[PDB]
Amino acid sequence: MPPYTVVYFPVRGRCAALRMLLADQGQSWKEEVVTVETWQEGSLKASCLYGQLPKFQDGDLTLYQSNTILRHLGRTLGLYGKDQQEAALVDMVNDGVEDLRCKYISLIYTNYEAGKDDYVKALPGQLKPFETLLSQNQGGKTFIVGDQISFADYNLLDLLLIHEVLAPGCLDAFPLLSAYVGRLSARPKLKAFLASPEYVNLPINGNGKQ
Amino acid sequence: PYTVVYFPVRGRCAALRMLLADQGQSWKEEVVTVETWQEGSLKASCLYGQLPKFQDGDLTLYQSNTILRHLGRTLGLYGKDQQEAALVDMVNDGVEDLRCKYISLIYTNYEAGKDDYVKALPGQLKPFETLLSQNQGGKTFIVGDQISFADYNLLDLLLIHEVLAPGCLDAFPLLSAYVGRLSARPKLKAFLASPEYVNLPINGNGKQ
Numbered sequence A: 001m002p003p004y005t006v007v008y009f010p011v012r013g014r015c016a017a018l019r020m021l022l023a024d025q026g027q028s029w030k031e032e033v034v035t036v037e038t039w040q041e042g043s044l045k046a047s048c049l050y051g052q053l054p055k056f057q058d059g060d061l062t063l064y065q066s067n068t069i070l071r072h073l074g075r076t077l078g079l080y081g082k083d084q085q086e087a088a089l090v091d092m093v094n095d096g097v098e099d100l101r102c103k104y105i106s107l108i109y110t111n112y113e114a115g116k117d118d119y120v121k122a123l124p125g126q127l128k129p130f131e132t133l134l135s136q137n138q139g140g141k142t143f144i145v146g147d148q149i150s151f152a153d154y155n156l157l158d159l160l161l162i163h164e165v166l167a168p169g170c171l172d173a174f175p176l177l178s179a180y181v182g183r184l185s186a187r188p189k190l191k192a193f194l195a196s197p198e199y200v201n202l203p204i205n206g207n208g209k210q
Numbered sequence B: 001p002y003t004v005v006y007f008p009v010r011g012r013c014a015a016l017r018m019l020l021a022d023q024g025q026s027w028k029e030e031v032v033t034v035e036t037w038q039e040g041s042l043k044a045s046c047l048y049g050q051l052p053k054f055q056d057g058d059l060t061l062y063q064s065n066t067i068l069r070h071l072g073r074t075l076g077l078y079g080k081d082q083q084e085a086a087l088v089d090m091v092n093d094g095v096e097d098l099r100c101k102y103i104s105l106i107y108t109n110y111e112a113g114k115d116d117y118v119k120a121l122p123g124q125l126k127p128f129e130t131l132l133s134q135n136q137g138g139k140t141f142i143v144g145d146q147i148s149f150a151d152y153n154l155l156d157l158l159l160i161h162e163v164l165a166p167g168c169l170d171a172f173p174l175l176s177a178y179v180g181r182l183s184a185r186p187k188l189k190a191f192l193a194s195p196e197y198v199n200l201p202i203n204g205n206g207k208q
């Protein structure tokens, strides 16, 4: 049996990046699907530390919070930079990704209809920093930080892929980010995973908007 | 060589300053006035257009939690092993989630939402009381038996909530004892009583 178990709703949401990480790294994991019915029952919610999913288990280590899970996997699987300097930069990129993810989630669940236009207008300004980080690292030819993949790469890749669905062509103005997405999307295991029913047949968000 | 660039408020820099002080580290403060910020040049050079900005030698960092993790990693305040490091991260993310709600209240709707906020508070503080009860009965730190960067961040969050809602920790025996115990550490105690800390407002709009 797999030592990894991810407990989540049947959506990609905040679990898309860690699933891409596990798949690309050749790890096995078990998915425990939580239906809205089961969640509204109350018992599972009450046992979750902050009353929220995802919940992750590595052996008998139970974790909550998507970024804690990413950092844990980054640390145990060696996807956290080659030294402390790179680890700090990997963290800085991930926090940036998380900041934009929060705005995206707010749009999707709070005011999709009304704020989608303003959101898409401000997007270039939000994506520029990542284009800049990439240009400073070997000319954007490898990963977001250093010359080895890190957990921040999977998180950034997911953020870019869901924005391409929200605003098709938003990456056209960013040559380095565009090439980065195509390059990472082509990795053997990741490519196989992104094309699988497991990934494709899951909606991005829980309210049907994207 | 540490340098923290920030506005003249405690805000998101309070915890890292408490960390540096308690650990006996020296740092230089570069104050950014609203005037200087509105000039535009500094903002434009900041990676995500925001402060704090931190320098460790020639390593320039942005994002308060990135700075905390960096100091946690280099100063040895990140748990004794990977299992503890993951738990330290889980506590910090929880602190950051409540901090975001606090900041939203303070700057978005202080007058209208303060009552609802204070009513929901016990529910938000319970998880930390529970974490503490599971660690040697709440007698040491939030994770393990050594202090971590999450302790300083949680301490700051609890101290600013006591200012917002005096007595909110009365219902939480472990959190109450935890605050008093950490607040009594020699260097931290000296720092929390200094002009450098005391004479700085908590937030930029005067609300607290």
Ligand SMILES: O=C(O)c1cc(/N=N/c2ccc(S(=O)(=O)Nc3ccccn3)cc2)ccc1O
Binding pocket: A009, A010, A011, A013, A014, A034, A035, A036, A105, A106, A109, A203, A205, A206, A207, A208
């Ligand atoms: O950050 C987040 O991930 C975030 C997520 C939020 N909600 N997620 C949800 C909400 C409802 C469900 S659900 O299981 O009831 N319904 C579903 C499940 C699968 C596909 C479509 N709908 C699944 C996920 C709501 C606010 C947020 O900030």
Ligand SMILES: O=C(O)c1cc(/N=N/c2ccc(S(=O)(=O)Nc3ccccn3)cc2)ccc1O
Binding pocket: B007, B008, B009, B011, B012, B032, B033, B034, B103, B104, B107, B201, B203, B204, B205, B206
């Ligand atoms: O997360 C945050 O830190 C956060 C911070 C925010 N604003 N911070 C500010 C805003 C204005 C200033 S300021 O330099 O113009 N004014 C000041 C400075 C010192 C004391 C009182 N006011 C200083 C900090 C606004 C929204 C946020 O979400």
Ligand SMILES: N[C@@H](CCC(=O)N[C@@H](CS)C(=O)NCC(=O)O)C(=O)O
Binding pocket: A013, A014, A051, A052, A053, A054, A064, A065, A066, A067, B093, B097
């Ligand atoms: N900060 C947490 C947030 C997790 C979160 O928002 N979970 C949502 C779904 S993705 C949830 O559990 N919603 C149910 C609820 O809060 O009632 C993380 O990064 O994992």
Ligand SMILES: N[C@@H](CCC(=O)N[C@@H](CS)C(=O)NCC(=O)O)C(=O)O
Binding pocket: A095, A099, B011, B012, B049, B050, B051, B052, B062, B063, B064, B065
């Ligand atoms: N996620 C960042 C947020 C930083 C932030 O919100 N900075 C605010 C003040 S603390 C800022 O620079 N505001 C000026 C602006 O954005 O115009 C962090 O944790 O440091």
